[PDB]
Write an enzyme that holds these catalytic residues in place. Structure first.
Site: not given
Ligand code: NA
Length: 223
Positions: A31, A33, A105
């Site tokens: 992502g 960030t 993730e």
């Molecule tokens: Na994601």
């Protein structure tokens, strides 16, 4: 002027570099960030033994910043996993997958000894649920999984035109009341045809670095 959202993301990403041990295997999330974090980690000069990636984009940025990449299959575990969140509550349970990568993730998080979440202030919420919940499903199970999610109470919406890393689809579920994040994480995963969902309750973060107007705030789970 008010600090922009990108500036808040950078504040959190830069502070998180301090949490990364040198000469260890680490896991890298996905992502915008995280993209600031990969840059900051590369610029820091820290020696990284190897990084496990969670998306094509994250792997490309790790290479751009000269951070060695290894397959998760080559390691017995990771010292720390760093990632963002679409929502993070006061227990540091999260909703993830807005960018499509929640399956990889959660895999990499589950192989890690510590989870550091990095986020701008807008991600920190009292209750999880306003952000639609991503659910990854195989293509032939789309209608079936959607009926089962609807029966649970949410409004399922196919993520039109999107194909996940492993070739599957995402159904985003709107309007869920999440009384018990761990219970819902497990109940959604009991639907045959679902591969993973974006509730991170079993893999809640250990610490949160939040970018705010007053700088990077470090936040542990509420007592
Ligand atoms: Na994601």
């Amino acid at each position: 002027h008010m600090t922009t959202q990108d500036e808040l993301k950078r504040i959190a990403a830069e502070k998180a570099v301090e949490f990364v041990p040198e000469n260890e295997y680490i896991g890298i999330g996905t992502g915008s960030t995280i993209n600031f974090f990969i840059e900051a980690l590369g610029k820091s000069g820290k020696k990284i033994k190897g990084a496990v990636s969670t998306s094509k984009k994250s792997g490309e940025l790790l290479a751009r910043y000269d951070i060695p990449v290894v397959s998760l299959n080559e390691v017995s575990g990771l010292a720390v996993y760093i990632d963002g969140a679409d929502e993070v509550n006061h227990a540091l349970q999260m909703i993830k997958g807005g960018g499509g990568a929640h399956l990889n993730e959660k895999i990499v998080a589950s192989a890690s000894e510590k989870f550091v979440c990095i986020a701008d202030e807008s991600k920190y919420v009292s209750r999880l649920g306003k952000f639609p919940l991503p659910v990854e499903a195989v293509e032939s199970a789309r209608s079936l999984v959607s009926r089962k999610l609807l029966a649970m109470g949410g409004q399922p919406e196919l993520r039109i035109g999107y194909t996940t890393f492993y070739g599957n689809q995402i159904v985003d579920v709107h309007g869920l009341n999440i009384d018990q994040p761990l219970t819902m994480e497990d109940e959604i995963n009991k639907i045959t045809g679902v591969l993973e969902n974006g509730i991170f309750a079993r893999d809640a973060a250990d610490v949160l670095i939040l970018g705010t107007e007053e700088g990077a705030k470090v936040i542990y789970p509420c007592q």
